[PDB]
């Protein structure tokens, strides 16, 4: 798709049987999803932004379906209001910024 | 141009006759830049991110050049990890996400 930025670029993602709304975010290095219980082992990691750092859990090789595209990678889970798909997955589905 | 996301999408902007680098962030609604003295009256503003709430200085109708495309709009100045160009000025320059 071509997505315009008049409004926040919310997209449908699917992780497991979970269907979810997610922000496609070029400004984020990592993908951080709201609190969910994924399988596998997890490292704690600190990530930051406007305001500070929050502690999240890091899970690897988690498959996420972004608009008909399968991406699999590191997903961080922690107390974010909004699901964030960052550059680690966006490169996987071929996403690009153009102007 | 078409910008790929293997690397952070860092760009050179020109604001107040000064060249700065800035992240193109589809995840942000607003443009917020490191502490700098711009001319204008400014209103105190409060915003929030992955970490939370903060105080910024808001400036209206600031001209910004982003890779030689010019935009004119609001710029918030405050303690951000990295200068970011948000959707308020990425729409002005006709930026899109594509995959």
mmCIF file of N, CA, C and O in Angstrom, chain B residues 15 19 23 29 31 39 74 79 81 94:
data_model
loop_
_atom_site.group_PDB
_atom_site.id
_atom_site.type_symbol
_atom_site.label_atom_id
_atom_site.label_comp_id
_atom_site.label_asym_id
_atom_site.label_seq_id
_atom_site.Cartn_x
_atom_site.Cartn_y
_atom_site.Cartn_z
ATOM 1 N N UNK B 15 16.990 25.338 9.757
ATOM 2 C CA UNK B 15 15.995 26.030 10.557
ATOM 3 C C UNK B 15 16.795 27.186 11.184
ATOM 4 O O UNK B 15 17.958 26.997 11.569
ATOM 5 N N UNK B 19 22.064 24.329 10.177
ATOM 6 C CA UNK B 19 21.926 22.967 9.701
ATOM 7 C C UNK B 19 21.897 21.993 10.859
ATOM 8 O O UNK B 19 22.796 22.021 11.686
ATOM 9 N N UNK B 23 15.596 13.038 12.648
ATOM 10 C CA UNK B 23 14.989 11.752 12.350
ATOM 11 C C UNK B 23 13.601 11.994 11.816
ATOM 12 O O UNK B 23 12.806 12.733 12.413
ATOM 13 N N UNK B 29 3.501 12.851 16.103
ATOM 14 C CA UNK B 29 2.557 13.811 15.534
ATOM 15 C C UNK B 29 3.154 15.197 15.286
ATOM 16 O O UNK B 29 2.759 15.866 14.328
ATOM 17 N N UNK B 31 6.777 17.967 15.631
ATOM 18 C CA UNK B 31 8.201 18.081 15.397
ATOM 19 C C UNK B 31 8.764 18.608 16.718
ATOM 20 O O UNK B 31 8.232 19.592 17.234
ATOM 21 N N UNK B 39 13.433 32.768 17.150
ATOM 22 C CA UNK B 39 12.647 33.966 17.346
ATOM 23 C C UNK B 39 11.176 33.659 17.228
ATOM 24 O O UNK B 39 10.715 32.916 16.362
ATOM 25 N N UNK B 74 4.521 24.533 13.042
ATOM 26 C CA UNK B 74 4.827 24.465 14.463
ATOM 27 C C UNK B 74 6.069 23.615 14.706
ATOM 28 O O UNK B 74 6.257 22.576 14.037
ATOM 29 N N UNK B 79 13.611 18.661 25.685
ATOM 30 C CA UNK B 79 14.594 17.595 25.919
ATOM 31 C C UNK B 79 14.243 16.303 25.178
ATOM 32 O O UNK B 79 13.585 15.429 25.709
ATOM 33 N N UNK B 81 15.722 12.969 23.016
ATOM 34 C CA UNK B 81 16.890 12.175 22.674
ATOM 35 C C UNK B 81 17.520 12.502 21.336
ATOM 36 O O UNK B 81 18.741 12.391 21.199
ATOM 37 N N UNK B 94 4.900 16.031 1.578
ATOM 38 C CA UNK B 94 4.331 14.959 0.777
ATOM 39 C C UNK B 94 4.985 13.613 1.026
ATOM 40 O O UNK B 94 5.136 12.778 0.137
#
